[PDB]
Design a binder for this molecule. Structure first.
Ligand SMILES: Nc1nc2c(ncn2[C@@H]2O[C@H](COP(=O)(O)OP(=O)(O)OP(O)(O)=S)[C@@H](O)[C@H]2O)c(=O)[nH]1
Ligand SMILES: [Mg+2]
Lengths: 142, 164
């Protein structure tokens, strides 16, 4: 009842970037890995939006750093897609899988290279991203 | 059951996400959150048969246009949405259609034209103009409102029938 409802508010707070509302919801027992209907966790929404503080907070609270939404994106896919560098770094220092595949086989490197995020491509390669990784169509990142 | 891979495409702000969340959760989101790429899953009954809808809700924003190829390769059917007070978004159906054809190397890809926001008072895109566009393309045309829920099931269920 309540616990489910704290999850939905945590999702909203993580998306809308309310750094302190997040801290409260957690201490009222909210689930750090609550899912929206698209399968996003709070860490996906915070990584997507570029809220570094909220990303740090969620990880300090046991957030699953390699959680996958219904498309198969991890938070590292989301941060890379939109060029959030410090987020990409922090996710990687907390054990993010650098070669995690979405449902079509795309790594974070695939998405970063697709959208031209060159600084993300470099940081990904420094962290053991595979240059020859293929998606499910046989296509590499380039 | 049979799984149908449905892809919702169209310009920024036409109601792709609001249509989709109406189908899945039966509620209308008044708030714009720009979509990158979201997947939704629903087990439904269509024409008396149980099936699963695997729905991808896509980015209208042109900054993500390089991701289109990928979802055009994977989708079985495309819900081509415009808003009835958004001339540009109607005109953009052409660009979406052309890319789909090129990626599937085919002129016959399951597709439905969706004129969204039919609850709105004034409109700049004529019903006749849209009916004509759909007849040119040889595809069905459905008028929807994510706000009232009008034509929501009809639109998705119609795309399913086109995949069959
Ligand atoms: N009046 C009315 N408003 C609608 C309807 N569908 C969506 N809207 C409104 O339009 C706005 C944008 O809708 P949204 O569903 O986010 O567009 P989108 O096509 O997903 O845009 P994007 O993610 O590619 S950037 C929202 O405020 C939403 O409430 C409708 O049928 N009628
Ligand atoms: Mg959307």
């Amino acid at each position: 009842g309540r616990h489910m409802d704290l999850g939905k508010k945590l999702l909203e707070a993580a998306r809308a970037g309310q750094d302190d509302e997040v801290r409260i919801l957690m201490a009222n027992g909210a689930d750090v890995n609550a899912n929206d209907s698209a399968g996003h966790t709070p860490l996906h929404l915070a990584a997507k939006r570029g809220h570094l503080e909220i990303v740090e907070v969620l990880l300090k609270h046991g957030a699953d750093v390699n959680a996958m939404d219904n498309t198969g994106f991890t938070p590292l896919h989301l941060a890379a897609l939109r060029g959030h560098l410090e987020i990409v770094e922090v996710l990687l220092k907390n054990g993010a899988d650098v070669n995690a595949q979405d449902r079509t086989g795309r790594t974070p490197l695939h998405l970063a290279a697709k959208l031209g995020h060159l600084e993300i491509v470099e940081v990904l390669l420094k962290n053991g991203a595979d240059v020859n990784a293929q998606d499910k169509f046989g296509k590499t990142a380039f | 059951m049979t799984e149908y891979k449905l892809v919702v495409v169209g310009a920024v702000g036409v109601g792709k996400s609001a249509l989709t969340i109406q189908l899945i959760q039966n509620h209308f989101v008044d708030e714009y959150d720009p979509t990158i790429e979201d997947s939704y899953r629903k087990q439904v009954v269509i024409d008396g048969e149980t099936c699963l809808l695997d729905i991808l809700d896509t980015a209208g924003q042109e900054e993500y246009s390089a991701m289109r190829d990928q979802y055009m390769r994977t989708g079985e059917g495309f819900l081509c949405v415009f808003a009835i007070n958004n001339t540009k978004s109607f005109e953009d159906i052409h660009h979406y259609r052309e890319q789909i054809k090129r990626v599937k190397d085919s002129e016959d890809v399951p597709m439905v034209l969706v004129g969204n926001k039919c609850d709105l008072p004034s409109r700049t895109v004529d019903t006749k103009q849209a009916q004509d566009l759909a007849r040119s393309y040889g595809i069905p045309f459905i008028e929807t409102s994510a706000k009232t829920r009008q034509g929501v099931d009809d639109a998705f269920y119609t795309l399913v029938r086109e995949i069959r």
